[PDB]
Amino acid sequence: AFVTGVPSLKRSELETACEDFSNIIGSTSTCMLYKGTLSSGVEIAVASSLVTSAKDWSKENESQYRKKITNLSKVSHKNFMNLLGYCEEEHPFTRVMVFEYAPNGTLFEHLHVREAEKLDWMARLRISMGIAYCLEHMHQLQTPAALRNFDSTTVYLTDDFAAKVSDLEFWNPDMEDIVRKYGMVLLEILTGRVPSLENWVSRYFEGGMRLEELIDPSIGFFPEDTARALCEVVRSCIDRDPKKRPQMKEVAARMREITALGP
Numbered sequence: 001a002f003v004t005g006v007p008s009l010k011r012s013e014l015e016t017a018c019e020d021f022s023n024i025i026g027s028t029s030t031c032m033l034y035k036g037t038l039s040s041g042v043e044i045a046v047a048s049s050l051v052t053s054a055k056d057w058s059k060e061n062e063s064q065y066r067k068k069i070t071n072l073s074k075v076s077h078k079n080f081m082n083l084l085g086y087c088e089e090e091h092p093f094t095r096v097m098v099f100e101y102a103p104n105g106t107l108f109e110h111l112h113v114r115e116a117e118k119l120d121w122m123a124r125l126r127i128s129m130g131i132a133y134c135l136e137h138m139h140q141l142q143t144p145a146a147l148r149n150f151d152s153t154t155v156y157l158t159d160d161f162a163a164k165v166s167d168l169e170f171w172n173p174d175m176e177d178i179v180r181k182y183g184m185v186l187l188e189i190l191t192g193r194v195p196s197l198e199n200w201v202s203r204y205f206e207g208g209m210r211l212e213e214l215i216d217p218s219i220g221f222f223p224e225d226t227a228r229a230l231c232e233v234v235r236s237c238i239d240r241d242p243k244k245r246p247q248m249k250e251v252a253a254r255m256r257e258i259t260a261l262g263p
């Protein structure tokens with residue numbers, strides 16, 4: 001065991017759950033993702049290193065592995081994609097982390113890829129609020145390392161479209177940097193726009209854009225003054241000077257106020 005709290009799986013266990021690793025959700029810089037189901041019926045996303053022998057794997061690699069598990073085992077939040085387990089094995093070489101499975105995939109997909117169906121206003125506020133609570137909690141745990149890769153492709157959506165912020169990448173940022181990224185992700189949620197943006201939105205901030213220009217047209221109707229308040233949160237978060245940015249606890253506080261949604 002490398003940690004208290006998080007169970008250490010036999011590879012035999014995980015082979016069962018993931019049908020001999022036969023079902024792939026995705027693939028990233030540092031890991032392959034396999035779909036599984038535990039004998040408890042709990043759906044899982046298994047993140048496996050891209051290293052297949054002890055040779056391609058350093059003691060630096062190993063040290064990073066155990067640090068990540070340590071750090072993530074300390075993070076537990078309803079709006080985080082929580083670590084459920086891990087599996088280290090030498091025969092054959094296995095370095096795995098087991099995460100919660102989010103059936104509605106990424107925020108990015110639901111904002112930009114699905115043409116037929118769009119997230120409504122209230123679902124967008126709920127997602128925005130959830131993200132903010134997650135980041136606030138992480139800043140309280142002093143583990144922003146888990147957020148070095150934060151953007152709409154790393155935020156997942158549950159059955160009921162709650163946000164789960166993820167940290168899937170094997171470990172080979174300021175909280176001020178995370179606050180700005182939160183600003184940009186909130187802006188993306190509001191507008192439906194993604195960096196192929198600051199210049200575009202500066203026109204809104206300059207006073208030369210109506211909210212019906214800024215807000216994602218797929219939304220339909222929306223409360224103007226709510227939208228206004230959310231855009232000020234964006235403006236605060238993305239200030240060019242990191243020192244002028246709100247703390248995440250202040251962001252979460254203001255967001256709670258505007259959305260009227262508790263943690």
Ligand SMILES: Cc1cc(Nc2cc(N3CCN(C)CC3)nc(/C=C/c3ccccc3)n2)n[nH]1
Binds near residue numbers: 027028045081099101
């Ligand atoms: C880590 C994790 C992912 C996850 N859920 C899901 C669900 C999902 N869906 C839902 C149903 N699918 C039929 C379509 C899209 N897609 C993904 C994609 C993951 C990925 C990540 C990086 C690169 C490439 C791909 N993750 N839960 N936990």
